[PDB]
Design an enzyme around this catalytic site. Structure first.
Site, mmCIF file in Angstrom:
data_model
loop_
_atom_site.group_PDB
_atom_site.id
_atom_site.type_symbol
_atom_site.label_atom_id
_atom_site.label_comp_id
_atom_site.label_asym_id
_atom_site.label_seq_id
_atom_site.Cartn_x
_atom_site.Cartn_y
_atom_site.Cartn_z
ATOM 1 N N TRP A 55 0.852 -1.175 0.000
ATOM 2 C CA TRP A 55 0.000 0.000 0.000
ATOM 3 C C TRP A 55 0.889 1.227 0.000
ATOM 4 C CZ3 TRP A 55 -4.865 0.900 -1.032
ATOM 5 C CH2 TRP A 55 -5.290 2.207 -0.973
ATOM 6 N N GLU A 74 7.444 -1.200 2.230
ATOM 7 C CA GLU A 74 7.102 -0.827 3.547
ATOM 8 C C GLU A 74 7.952 -1.790 4.493
ATOM 9 O OE1 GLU A 74 2.577 -0.555 4.221
ATOM 10 O OE2 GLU A 74 2.948 -1.548 2.241
HETATM 11 C C1 LIG Z 1 2.337 2.582 3.783
HETATM 12 C C2 LIG Z 1 1.484 3.739 3.314
HETATM 13 N N1 LIG Z 1 1.972 4.650 2.370
HETATM 14 C C3 LIG Z 1 1.169 5.683 1.916
HETATM 15 C C4 LIG Z 1 -0.177 5.886 2.427
HETATM 16 C C5 LIG Z 1 -1.045 6.956 1.846
HETATM 17 O O1 LIG Z 1 -0.849 8.215 2.490
HETATM 18 P P1 LIG Z 1 -1.907 9.170 1.955
HETATM 19 O O2 LIG Z 1 -3.185 8.509 2.084
HETATM 20 O O3 LIG Z 1 -1.965 10.293 2.885
HETATM 21 O O4 LIG Z 1 -1.599 9.689 0.645
HETATM 22 C C6 LIG Z 1 -0.715 4.982 3.430
HETATM 23 C C7 LIG Z 1 -2.112 5.185 4.028
HETATM 24 N N2 LIG Z 1 -2.995 4.302 3.886
HETATM 25 C C8 LIG Z 1 -4.219 4.162 4.604
HETATM 26 C C9 LIG Z 1 -5.021 5.502 4.564
HETATM 27 C C10 LIG Z 1 -4.668 3.128 3.705
HETATM 28 C C11 LIG Z 1 -5.777 3.417 2.840
HETATM 29 C C12 LIG Z 1 -6.247 2.399 1.962
HETATM 30 C C13 LIG Z 1 -5.582 1.101 1.965
HETATM 31 C C14 LIG Z 1 -4.439 0.839 2.858
HETATM 32 C C15 LIG Z 1 -3.995 1.850 3.714
HETATM 33 P P2 LIG Z 1 -4.023 3.437 6.175
HETATM 34 O O5 LIG Z 1 -3.598 4.448 7.172
HETATM 35 O O6 LIG Z 1 -5.357 2.812 6.583
HETATM 36 O O7 LIG Z 1 -2.971 2.351 6.193
HETATM 37 C C16 LIG Z 1 0.153 3.882 3.859
HETATM 38 O O8 LIG Z 1 -0.253 2.936 4.751
#
Ligand SMILES: Cc1ncc(COP(=O)(O)O)c(/C=N/[C@@](C)(c2ccccc2)P(=O)(O)O)c1O
Ligand SMILES: Cc1ncc(COP(=O)(O)O)c(/C=N/[C@@](C)(c2ccccc2)P(=O)(O)O)c1O
Ligand SMILES: Cc1ncc(COP(=O)(O)O)c(/C=N/[C@@](C)(c2ccccc2)P(=O)(O)O)c1O
Ligand SMILES: Cc1ncc(COP(=O)(O)O)c(/C=N/[C@@](C)(c2ccccc2)P(=O)(O)O)c1O
Ligand SMILES: [K+]
Ligand SMILES: [K+]
Ligand SMILES: [K+]
Ligand SMILES: [K+]
Ligand code: NA
Ligand code: NA
Ligand code: NA
Ligand code: NA
Lengths: 431, 431, 431, 431
Positions: free
Chosen positions: A136, A208
């Site tokens: 993600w 990640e």
């Molecule tokens: C490793 C990583 N990199 C970038 C981002 C993106 O940052 P921005 O949203 O601010 O651009 C996220 C955020 N993802 C969320 C909103 C999400 C949303 C949907 C699926 C998985 C995780 P979550 O907090 O629930 O994990 C992230 O985990």
């Protein structure tokens, strides 16, 4: 009440829906480790808001800096430098591992990943990007093309040259070698495949440190390192996305520091802005220089904005000064125990994992089959809220759903236990 | 002094470069229409920071709301609603034209464009996007693939299905029909080409009402309307990017309202956050509903964050209440006159265009050949700064460079003239 | 002599080079299982020319039909039917498994694969294609984008949506499950990955029954079948490329008939034209019908040309009538024995595999490490030629080089042995 | 009769449909300028089969060479040279313009275009290809991605980097400059657009000298030349597709020779194999050399096959020797007159164009509006057949349908007139 019909009417009337379910409540305020509905019920915040709030809600410190810059140096022309900005960039070059020299101050993590990606493409002369299959990285273009945990279907072709390899997953391992999970051989094995699919345009691998949304997946001992060698070998950069892992959450200022493995570019956002929209990337001076001979461009409205820059510094500060990196280990440890304790009580608790104040609990029907507990996960989740504890469950294909526990680094001991307790209850009621 | 060696050292040491040249100064503060260096020189801000600050720097109003929410409801879990958020979404549905019903609250304009793009792709089942050849939509993926004014080279293939058509440009017209610029026929003519290139997957057309970075290019009378018909005809959405045009700058709350033409999705950011990182999209309830049956997802960290949401409302408010939309027409007019006046004095001034408080002056060697004035543009620019007036020049291929003048809607009369005056001077010295 | 300087001059002067090394000789003629240089040396043809000549060189039968049609019905307007054409299409629908109903008469195997690919894309409404990582389908676009054994680098992005999974390889297995090559689990495991990479646009999987160029890799017992289920499960077609496997070579009219597994589209070429450029695809009447409601188009110059169509029929005929499918089993068996016999003599002979008159011998340094024999392979190869036996070695990364033995189905017993013998010699001299 | 139910049954039973309508007849044979149905009706062949048969059907010469090689040197291993092959490559280097040195002997025109495309990509290090919006290059991948006259919809994304510019069309011009079709400015104007869309990866431009399928569109005086300069300017190759224009059809051995403009790569097929599947590309020795240092690969089954190679030589020969290039000018002229004559009789005849023995007649409702004659075109077409004259009409969007007249270079005078006559009749009956 949380019942303001008008509120809900309008809410219904004018909101774009963009994922999930809306919490049926009306959050009136938030302080420390709590949010409070329109009734005044305090809700224990175990996710640090959207996994950002590292000092909790409304930390007096941020409140000060914020107010402060808001009224002194708010926003500027992208090509005008100011103190906060240089200070932050520097701090950053300073608290990051050796080899991380120059920083870029942006607003979001997807953004930050995009800035990063373009930069490797610019410098390698290549375009192929590789991530984990349960990755993600963001909602935007490149970030999105690299995202595999979710969101790939029905929105057109992805970016050209996107690949993914499975992530080293000790809990639900699928790579045998002499009767053991040879996740290292997996690595090898994937890469040979990728290699075979390349147009010969490998530019980077993005990852990640611990797959948050992918289910709290920690790269096993030696992975990262192995990984890095994989890139270096093929002339690719290794971009490390620490949107959630960065800034002390895992119990180190930076997860990569745990492995003692430093990426080509590192990216920060959530935990960096501690709730506020600030993001960044950091790279070696060499990579920067080249990007620069090559015309790297990533000009925004808020690139280099004093107010936001101001905020992260303060955060950063606070963090250090309050030794929250460590506080995160302590409490993180306090929480785990508790988790395992529930794990002792409850069979549906198939797994307790993570690092620092980033843990996940995997829900299973039975430990022996590690069969995902369907509905169960959410009942628990649902019950927590009743109990007045905010939680987050993730459900991918192939695995029991995972609660993603990420309370503030400023969380208190008591706060910890409380969560723990409401959780056992919620597990109790949920079965 | 602006000379703090340490400052500059670090600046050199730790900053990623991402476009342009860094202003040689150290901005210590900013109020109303001014920024001030480390010496205390007040610099007249004719670009509204990075073209955002619509109430100027540090408007007491924002300062209040900001402080306020910062300490009350800062950041929340993306799936938890709050007042500011519903209020803003609503206002927005309210002040926008009919047919714009639901909103999505994000952080950046590239972001906002991405959210939009994905949404049309999701709803059409298609993936091909079309913009102007001198367009600018963002640094990120889709936004970037749609951006043609600049940044396309050396960073890999663009997104699959990206096309562009020339923009209707009355100043440097290239489409003759019976001895006149039949920009309408251009339209037709382009589209037939596009049509011929389509895989049959036209999903949308994206457009800036007035091409800001493209050189302040105003879509001529009837264009938009014609355009819209082009999409409707091919089952495509028309996304209107009002990052700079939106929120009163052109002398209407929304540029599209000038044409009386309402897009399928409208996008906001710069002028919306008035310096702060807040962005949004707005769409019809129908499109939203469908996106929704289809699983539209665009979940972020800061999607729906109280503090930011708070800020835009206030902005919005202020705007209305201070009748700044109109103030922008007034002063915008005051400025033009002045511009034309200089245009009367100076031949290098080949063109005076724009709308409201969004004007551009095109620099030419001679009016007759409309030959771009090379170096000239920047001398002027350079001299302005000396004179203590901040300015912005854009130079594309094919056209004299354009100063992009976008002072705060809160700018004063006197402020106007002053700019005007320093400009004549700077033109004087520059020749 | 083979020395005609002029010949070689011109050869040097005017030939585009397109792979490999040019045989230093001047082939003056070819009959049955032999070609003959400018000196008159007969060269035993163990590759059936470029793996086509299934009746050998200049089979009197083809010579008759050829002459015949050449002077009666040569070439026609693509939209005019003739006998040979209907006859061939029919035969084909006839000798192919149930479910293969309609045929398309083309010229090359890449062509045939392209026709196939477009057809699945047209009918699924999708665009993602999946092949083996050691696949070979053609030099052209789609065919080429699906080709993984070789040719991917330095010629731009591949076709959007191209993936590959490793091929079930019993000789150099890499997937363990409970201490055994669970190639079935490999399957599963790959697909889950692919699944995770899909934009949700799986249209097909393309596969060679036995990877010829990939090193004579035979899909293990149950693979195909398993495979087919993988597609069916995801709404994808399974296209079977029998350019080399088809028409009796493996000891069945069609390799897929061995597995008793019938693909969605089957493709033929090399062995079909028996040296002449004729190709084809065959599909179910259902798929055809739909392709047809959908406007399937694949119109060529030689689509449906009488002369070529004439030739394949004759081939086909001959094949049947001479029971060459069986002759191929017999001799194929005669050859194997011989191979194993050499394998008994020589350690460098790491593996003897294939089917029918399609076998490959893998060269290794030592059986225990299965370490590819570098240079060795070619010495042997080189020596064969001296010995006056034509051969072909394939060298991929990761595996000892493979001789690809594919003599005419019309080959004689004696012919067999002879090859066998020159081979032992060549092995002898080569060590 | 043409009624063989069985024939038609099977035809229905087992044929893949791949475009158009099947002629309701059963062609039993073909000689010179005629084909003959199952009834024995001779049909005057005005399209040279599928626009290939340059010596007509069953030319005794080809019949000789064919038989000959068929029984002497049929097919060989792609890496073995023979006489026909070197002879042909040479001839070719010989009869082509200076700068065309080395040749590659393949089977189809799509093939030939693919070989070409890959080669420019390989040598430029780029991947973007540009063609005419009414282009036709083949059914396969790259060829297909470059094809704009038709076949783009419903079969997935095209190849990455595909663009098209409008073709210079004097009959239905759309680019005004000072009250005239400044097709040169069109050029410029398109290219600037393309330029703006490039990722900076222009590798080539591909073009038919006269757009056959696009409606017999002849590149106007100076175009080609201008064009060439466009490529050279941007470091792109210019590939000239002479599948139909090549080999004497337009009244020169090669159309490009008319302009006196020599491309980077030239491609041949239809007219080269004169009905048989033989194709080729030709390039400069320099480009070849580089392709070669770079590993150019385009290895096929029939690349360099003696029999086919044999055939084109003979063709080539015959052509020269019979001065058919000229015969084509003569008769081509005889035909035109006739066409214009009908044009004098009939108003629906909106335009008479082409070159040599490649002409097209555009059907209009009225000359003044140049409004395409809908249905009319086909009635004529339909009536011709009744009349026993084979014809071909093309109908694109925007233009009256075009009969594409391309009779054999061996056509007789009388043959000409006859066609002419049946045509007037057919026009008569058709109105
Ligand atoms: C490793 C990583 N990199 C970038 C981002 C993106 O940052 P921005 O949203 O601010 O651009 C996220 C955020 N993802 C969320 C909103 C999400 C949303 C949907 C699926 C998985 C995780 P979550 O907090 O629930 O994990 C992230 O985990
Ligand atoms: C119409 C439009 N849409 C989205 C955006 C992007 O918003 P974000 O940057 O916040 O994501 C911009 C901002 N572009 C700037 C920074 C720019 C930069 C580079 C080239 C042109 C314009 P500028 O203010 O100089 O015009 C914009 O004009
Ligand atoms: C300039 C050009 N290049 C390559 C080719 C392709 O050669 P191959 O078919 O042998 O590969 C063709 C052939 N196209 C035909 C079959 C066609 C078919 C469909 C649309 C237009 C033209 P047509 O003869 O009717 O024009 C061609 O014109
Ligand atoms: C399974 C398969 N499908 C299509 C084709 C292509 O048919 P066309 O060439 O006629 O279009 C081939 C031919 N490939 C050869 C030339 C090759 C060449 C290069 C690499 C591997 C194999 P080889 O005979 O040496 O295997 C093939 O094996
Ligand atoms: K800024
Ligand atoms: K949020
Ligand atoms: K044909
Ligand atoms: K060959
Ligand atoms: Na560092
Ligand atoms: Na509205
Ligand atoms: Na069958
Ligand atoms: Na020449």
């Amino acid at each position: 009440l949380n019942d303001d019909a008008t509120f809900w009417r309008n809410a219904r009337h004018h909101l774009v829906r963009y994922g999930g379910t809306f919490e049926p409540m009306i959050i009136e305020r938030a302080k420390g480790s709590f949010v409070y509905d329109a009734d005044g019920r305090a809700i224990l915040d175990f996710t640090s808001g959207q996994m950002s709030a590292v000092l909790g809600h409304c930390h007096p410190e941020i409140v000060s800096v914020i107010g402060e810059y808001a009224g002194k140096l708010d926003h500027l022309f992208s090509e005008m430098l100011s103190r906060p900005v240089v200070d932050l960039a520097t701090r950053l070059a300073n608290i990051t591992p050796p080899g991380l020299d120059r920083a870029l101050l942006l607003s979001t993590g997807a953004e930050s990943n995009e800035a990063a990606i373009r930069m490797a493409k610019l410098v390698t002369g290549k375009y192929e990007i590789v991530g984990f299959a349960q990755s993600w990285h963001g909602m935007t273009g490149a970030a999105a093309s690299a995202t595999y945990s979710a969101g790939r279907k029905g929105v057109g072709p992805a970016a050209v040259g996107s690949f993914a390899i499975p992530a080293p997953f000790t809990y639900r391992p699928r790579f045998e070698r002499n009767g053991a999970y040879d996740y290292l051989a997996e690595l090898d094995y994937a890469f040979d495949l990728i290699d075979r699919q390349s147009s010969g345009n490998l530019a980077a691998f993005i990852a990640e440190p611990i797959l948050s949304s992918g289910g709290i997946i920690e790269l096993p001992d030696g992975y990262m390192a192995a990984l890095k060698r994989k890139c270096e070998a093929r002339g690719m950069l290794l971009i490390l996305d620490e949107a959630q892992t960065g800034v002390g959450r895992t119990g180190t200022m930076f997860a990569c520091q745990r492995d003692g493995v430093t990426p080509d570019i590192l990216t920060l956002s959530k935990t960096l802005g501690a709730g506020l929209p600030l993001a960044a990337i950091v790279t070696s001076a060499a990579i920067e220089e080249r990007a620069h001979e090559l015309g790297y461009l990533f000009y925004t409205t808020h690139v280099s904005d004093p107010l936001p820059a101001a905020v992260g510094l303060r955060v950063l500060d606070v963090v250090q000064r309050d030794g929250l990196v460590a506080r995160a280990n302590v409490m993180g440890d306090r929480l785990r125990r508790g988790l395992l304790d529930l794990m002792e009580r409850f069979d549906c608790i198939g797994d307790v994992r993570g690092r620092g104040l980033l843990l996940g609990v995997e829900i299973v029907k039975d430990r022996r089959t590690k069969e995902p507990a369907d509905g169960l996960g959410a009942k628990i989740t649902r019950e927590c809220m009743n109990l007045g504890l905010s939680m987050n469950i993730v459900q991918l294909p192939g695995m029991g759903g995972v609660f993603r526990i990420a309370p503030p680094l400023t969380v208190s001991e008591d706060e910890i236990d409380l969560g723990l307790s409401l959780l056992g209850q919620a597990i109790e009621r949920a079965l």
